């Protein structure tokens, strides 16, 4: 109950500041004020057009590496096992293959951003 | 691909079905099917053109969707019975979605529409893997739960596949599309008999595979993608005309070839179970396959189509193919009906 209570208060405080910030100040809306900023000149296109991602391969590698750490985060419970040798070999093998995967991608220039 | 990539990817292609066939747990069976999907995609798209990209994408979205439905059934059964295998007490709807999703993975009609398109978009040697090695894992699952399956859904899938495999293959001029429709028709036969006698499902799978493998090797010899391309065989590799003709007639199930055996035995077993009407319909529409195979035989070995001047330069060159696996499979796929009693029991 307590965790729910404090997070609601955190939400409540943030939303109150937003309401104050939008209803206290004097406003003056006109078109030139609300147009998008681009260093004093008009944009030549939408900001909604495609924006190329040069690190796209690192990005999807990160998806796999993020499930690798998910497999590592039970380790504090796993070190309590009687089967210490089995746990240790499994953890060593898991870390080593992930290193080999990173090493391969590194030597394939998979960490280099595209030009 | 460099050697390390080939070894890892081909090993994973091999591994997935082995996991599926050896697993007691349904989750590990699903894991095996997951390995197959993931590992085969880079091979499908290896050549990297718009058609191969289309083929790999269509294959991915179909297979991943079917994999989720299979997982739903496994999870629902785990909820119902607290176990990781389907039982006699598993809810029938759970089993019917497993059958639906596996049949979509296999490309059985009416979940077939993807398969002729994907086969058309990929290299011949990948079509070979798609239509042979990749069938084994989903079929292996079905064979395990054959007493639990609904005969009504199976026969409807089976007759639909035979009908659409037949009419589908009738309109094709592309070889890769003809093989895909041949796959669908033969899967219809494999499935029809699975709930009655799963050993005859395996007999049909084996005979289909040893017919399809050398047929793909024959296409691979000159990279014949169309009827008009294969019709130049008489000028490029005439020695293959005898075995292609017999393999095509064997695929069509004409006696006294080995390919008559699966249709013959499945009819016998279906009628031991009073499945007379379906067996009649299946056998009658399977003749339509023999029609488009015959038209193919007409354009390769029984007539000689016009050739071209550049083909003379080909006759100056020596070839190093086919390997001797072609001759072994070609002979055993056509001339082994005398040994029929050793193949069914």
């Amino acid at each position: 109950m307590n965790l729910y209570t404090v997070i609601f208060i955190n939400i409540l405080l943030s939303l109150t500041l937003i309401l104050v910030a939008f209803w206290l100040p004097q406003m003056n809306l006109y078109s030139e004020k609300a147009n998008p900023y681009e260093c004093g000149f008009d944009p030549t296109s939408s900001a909604r057009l495609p924006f190329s991602m040069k690190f796209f391969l690192v990005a999807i590698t990160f998806l796999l590496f993020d499930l690798e750490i998910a497999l590592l985060l039970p380790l504090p419970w796993a070190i309590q096992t009687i089967k210490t040798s089995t746990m240790m070999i499994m953890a060593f093998i898991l870390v080593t293959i992930l290193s080999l995967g990173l090493a391969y991608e590194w030597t394939q220039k998979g960490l280099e951003w595209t030009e | 691909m460099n050697p390390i990539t080939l070894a890892i990817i081909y090993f994973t292609i091999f591994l997935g079905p082995v996991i599926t066939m050896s697993s007691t747990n349904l989750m590990l069976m699903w894991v095996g099917l997951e390995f197959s999907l993931l590992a085969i995609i880079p091979m499908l798209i290896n050549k990297k053109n718009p058609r191969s990209t289309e083929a790999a994408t269509k294959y991915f979205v179909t297979q991943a969707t079917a994999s989720m439905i299979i997982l739903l059934a496994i999870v629902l059964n785990y909820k119902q019975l607290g176990t990781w295998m389907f039982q006699q007490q598993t809810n029938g709807l759970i089993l019917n979605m497993t059958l639906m999703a596996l049949s979509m993975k296999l490309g059985l009609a009416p979940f077939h529409f993807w398969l002729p398109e994907v086969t058309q978009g990929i290299p011949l040697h990948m079509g070979l893997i798609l239509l042979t090695w990749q069938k084994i894992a989903p079929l292996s699952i079905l064979i395990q739960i054959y007493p639990l399956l609904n005969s009504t859904i199976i026969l409807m899938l089976a007759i639909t596949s035979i009908f659409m495999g037949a009419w589908g293959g009738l309109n094709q001029t592309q070889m890769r599309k003809i093989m895909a429709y041949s796959s669908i028709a033969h899967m219809g036969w494999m499935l029809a008999i699975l709930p009655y006698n799963p050993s005859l499902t395996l007999l049909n799978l084996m005979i289909y595979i040893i017919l399809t493998a050398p047929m793909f090797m024959a296409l691979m010899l000159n990279n014949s993608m169309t009827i008009n391309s294969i019709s130049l065989l008489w000028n490029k590799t005439p020695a293959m005309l005898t075995m292609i003709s017999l393999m095509l007639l064997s695929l069509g199930g004409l006696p006294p070839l080995t390919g008559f055996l699966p249709k013959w035995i499945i009819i016998t077993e279906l009628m031991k179970n009073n499945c007379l009407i379906m067996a009649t319909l299946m056998a009658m529409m399977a003749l339509l396959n023999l029609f488009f195979y015959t038209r193919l035989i007409y354009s390769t070995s029984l007539t000689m189509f016009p050739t071209n001047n550049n083909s003379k330069m080909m006759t100056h060159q020596t070839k190093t193919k086919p390997n001797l696996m072609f001759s072994t499979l070609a002979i055993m796929s056509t001339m082994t009906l005398p040994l029929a009693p050793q193949l069914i029991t």
């Binding site: - | 005969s151 026969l155 009655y196 031991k272 179970n273 009073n274 499945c275 007379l276 009407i277 379906m278």
Partner: protein, 142 residues
């Protein structure tokens, strides 16, 4: 469900009697086949607009329902007039009448003629199956 029972009511009484109820049952069955076929048609061969898709769904369903009505009516009237409840010929006449209807709706004597023979033979064989206890989807026995 009760929907299944509504279709078992076709065989509750011998042919040639209760021809009104049997005509509703076969009209309903024909309509369902038209709805299924229409669904695959519009999904796989989409129309140029929604009003054409809906127009095509109605064309298929009513045509399929008409075929089922003519088959069910003609079969029962034929058995009533000929006083032969258990004759597969009554079903052949009904299946031919259904086949003629299909040709009349699609403006084709070849479909009428080809429809009559194929649908007559299929319907006659259905009656023989009902009499001789054939199973369409037998469960495994051996």
């Amino acid at each position: 469900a009760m929907v299944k029972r509504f279709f078992e009511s076709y065989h509750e009484v011998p042919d040639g009697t209760q021809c009104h109820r049997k005509t509703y049952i076969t009209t309903a069955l024909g309509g369902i086949c038209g709805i299924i076929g229409s669904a695959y048609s519009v999904s796989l061969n989409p129309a140029d607009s929604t009003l054409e898709a809906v127009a095509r769904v109605g064309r298929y369903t009513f045509t399929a329902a008409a075929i089922g009505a003519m088959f069910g009516l003609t079969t029962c009237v034929s058995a009533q007039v000929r006083e032969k409840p258990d004759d597969p010929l009554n079903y052949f006449i009904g299946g031919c009448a259904g086949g003629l209807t299909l040709g009349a709706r699609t403006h084709s004597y070849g479909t009428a003629a080809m429809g009559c023979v194929y649908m007559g033979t299929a319907a006659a064989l259905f009656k023989i199956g009902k009499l001789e206890g054939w199973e369409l989807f037998p469960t495994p026995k051996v």
